[PDB]
Amino acid sequence: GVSLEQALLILSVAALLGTTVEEAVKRALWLKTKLGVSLEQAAFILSVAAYLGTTVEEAVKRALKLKTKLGVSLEQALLILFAAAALGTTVEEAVKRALKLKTKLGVSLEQALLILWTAAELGTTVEEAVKRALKLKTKLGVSLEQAQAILVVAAELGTTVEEAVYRALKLKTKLGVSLEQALLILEVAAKLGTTVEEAVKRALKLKTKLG
């Protein structure tokens, strides 16, 4: 039950790490096996360690200690570490900022941590990122989460958000994928230095390899 999403996430992590898909597969599967987590979560851990600038062992150690410290899930600890690595701050500072933003926007801590990460990814203030994202939310009728993903995809593509949404909706129409999946395909192709068709072709080959 290896999904196209899972294959696309692997391709993305191969690009982030600057290694082959074969190497990223192996590295992700070793870590999934070692920790008994999902493939998606193993890919997320590889991404967090890249962002932290630590080894994977070290990132896992930090995440497990932070789970116990705050009583949160592994996923939440990883998101806190990620938001802190993107901010260049301590986890305590990251969570402090998330809590202030949580109260301001009336969103969850997890949503606030994602916003902080996204603003850092865009090189903008949070206020700017939230303004842009909320414009999209209202204009397109997408979630705040979806709007943030659109901002990030557009940046990877080197285009406006209008361009990114135009392409994503074409992929939805043509291939019957969700907007989320269309955005992921777009992002992966940009990260790999390929066309959308070639990214999807690769993903399918990889999905099968792991069948």
Numbering used by the authors: 23 to 233
Manuscript text:
Here we address these limitations by introducing an artificial metathase—an artificial metalloenzyme designed for ring-closing metathesis—for whole-cell biocatalysis. Our approach integrates a tailored metal cofactor into a hyper-stable, de novo-designed protein. By combining computational design with genetic optimization, a binding affinity (KD ≤ 0.2 μM) between the protein scaffold and cofactor is achieved through supramolecular anchoring. From the catalyst perspective, we sought to address this challenge by designing a derivative of the Hoveyda–Grubbs catalyst (hereafter Ru1) that contains a polar motif, aimed at interacting via H-bonds with the protein, as well as improving the cofactor solubility in aqueous media.
To further improve the affinity and ensure near quantitative binding at low micromolar concentrations of dnTRP_18, we set out to increase the hydrophobicity around the Ru1 binding site. For this purpose, positions F43 and F116 were individually mutated to tryptophan. Both dnTRP_18_F43W and dnTRP_18_F116W (hereafter dnTRP_R0) displayed a nearly tenfold higher affinity with KD = 0.26 ± 0.05 and 0.16 ± 0.04 μM at pH 4.2, respectively. A comparison of apo and Ru1·dnTRP_R0-ΔHis X-ray structures with computational models reveals an overall agreement with the toroidal shape but notable deviations with regards to the shape of the inner cavity, as well as the position the Ru1 cofactor. The Cα root mean square deviation values between the AF2 predicted models and the X-ray structures range from 1.59 to 1.63 Å.
